Amino acid sequence: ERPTFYRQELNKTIWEVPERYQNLSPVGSGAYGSVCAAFDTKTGLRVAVKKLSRPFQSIIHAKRTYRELRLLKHMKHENVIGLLDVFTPARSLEEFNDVYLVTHLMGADLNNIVKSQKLTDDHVQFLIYQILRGLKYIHSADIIHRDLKPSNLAVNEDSELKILDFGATRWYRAPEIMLNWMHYNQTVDIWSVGCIMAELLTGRTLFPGTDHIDQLKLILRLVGTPGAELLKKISSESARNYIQSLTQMPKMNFANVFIGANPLAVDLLEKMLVLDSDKRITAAQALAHAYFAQYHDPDDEPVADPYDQSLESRDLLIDEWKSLTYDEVISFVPPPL
Numbered sequence: 317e318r319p320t321f322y323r324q325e326l327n328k329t330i331w332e333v334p335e336r337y338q339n340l341s342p343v344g345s346g347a348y349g350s351v352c353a354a355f356d357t358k359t360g361l362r363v364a365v366k367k368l369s370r371p372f373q374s375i376i377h378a379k380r381t382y383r384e385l386r387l388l389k390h391m392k393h394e395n396v397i398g399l400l401d402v403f404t405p406a407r408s409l410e411e412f413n414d415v416y417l418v419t420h421l422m423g424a425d426l427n428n429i430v431k432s433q434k435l436t437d438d439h440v441q442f443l444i445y446q447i448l449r450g451l452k453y454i455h456s457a458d459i460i461h462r463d464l465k466p467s468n469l470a471v472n473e474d475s476e477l478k479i480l481d482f483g484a485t486r487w488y489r490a491p492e493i494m495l496n497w498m499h500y501n502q503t504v505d506i507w508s509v510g511c512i513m514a515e516l517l518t519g520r521t522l523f524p525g526t527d528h529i530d531q532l533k534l535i536l537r538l539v540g541t542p543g544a545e546l547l548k549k550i551s552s553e554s555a556r557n558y559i560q561s562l563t564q565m566p567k568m569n570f571a572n573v574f575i576g577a578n579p580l581a582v583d584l585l586e587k588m589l590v591l592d593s594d595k596r597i598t599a600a601q602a603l604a605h606a607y608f609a610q611y612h613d614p615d616d617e618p619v620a621d622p623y624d625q626s627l628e629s630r631d632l633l634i635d636e637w638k639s640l641t642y643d644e645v646i647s648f649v650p651p652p653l
């Protein structure tokens with residue numbers, strides 16, 4: 317049976333939700349979009365309901381709506397955001413204009429956990445382990461996050477962590493993304509992890525650049541200027557010439573940057589924050605690293621089913637994206653509680 321819906325004025329608009337979702341009230345001010353906290357009476361969970369803004373206004377909007385819904389429907393891992401529900405008040409394709417996404421209500425992101433303070437080594441181990449476990453899964457589906465940072469990491473009271481993407485902001489970006497490289501390795505995400513880890517250990521931003529060029533300046537100070545093997549890999553003549561014109565600075569001693577840190581943590585950081593992306597440790601390799609001895613379990617670090625990114629990259633008409641999105645809404649099956 318189709319659930320009974322009720323209507324209510326929220327965020328300047330008329331929301332229409334199934335009655336299982338009780339006591340809607342706006343959260344985040346507006347920083348997560350049009351979102352209300354709610355209580356799901358069916359499951360006994362506090363949830364967040366997001367009303368997608370203008371989902372089918374343009375081809376780009378329609379495409380984004382379909383890409384996010386399809387992707388979130390595919391994500392089924394403890395350390396990655398999942399969808400609790402998705403619904404529309406519409407009874408048919410003809411009147412289909414709104415899409416609501418339902419997730420767990422999240423009380424905190426990683427910054428709310430850190431508060432610019434050092435964490436214990438055991439706590440760092442646990443948090444980084446979970447990020448890497450979630451990344452192994454995401455990367456196995458051939459997906460690159462590309463914007464991993466503390467505000468994209470949800471963390472509950474028992475420090476259980478989920479990777480999401482809400483869509484300063486450059487502090488965790490891989491140098492090759494800063495340089496508009498275009499053939500990104502999955503290890504761009506590993507760079508971000510190294511930056512996050514370093515901050516958890518020290519309670520300070522590793523590379524707090526003031527602007528774009530400063531960010532790169534700070535990075536090079538730690539990891540040194542490119543060696544000969546890396547110089548060989550630069551197709552760009554201008555990039556090649558400029559780096560050749562630079563003054564050679566050696567890699568810093570990480571042990572003398574993270575003073576008093578677990579030497580296993582120092583070792584891992586050295587393997588994450590390598591300028592040459594081809595030489596960075598992968599998510600799977602990082603999980604097997606000794607730093608995570610107390611958490612690593614080879615039999616419970618699952619991979620994803622294959623994910624088709626070509627379907628979302630098509631050039632389709634607005635009503636085609638809308639119909640395909642509608643199908644995704646209708647075929648949705650909630651997770652086992």
Ligand SMILES: Cc1ccc(-n2nc(C(C)(C)C)cc2NC(=O)Nc2nc(CCOCc3cccnc3)cs2)cc1
Pocket residue numbers: 343344348351364365366380381383384387388391396397417419420421422423454459460461479480481482483
């Ligand atoms: C176009 C596009 C496509 C794919 C993505 N991706 N890619 C990923 C992964 C690659 C899987 C990481 C994840 C997303 N998307 C994603 O996380 N979306 C979210 N939507 C909400 C609902 C609103 O916040 C609720 C709330 C707010 C405050 C408190 N408590 C709850 C949460 S997380 C993004 C954009």
Ligand SMILES: CCCCCCCCO[C@@H]1O[C@H](CO)[C@@H](O)[C@H](O)[C@H]1O
Pocket residue numbers: 491492495497498499500501532542546549559591592593594
């Ligand atoms: C002056 C700053 C130099 C930064 C150089 C960053 C090099 C990143 O590393 C590069 O990543 C590319 C994109 O995935 C790969 O194609 C290359 O093989 C790899 O060497």
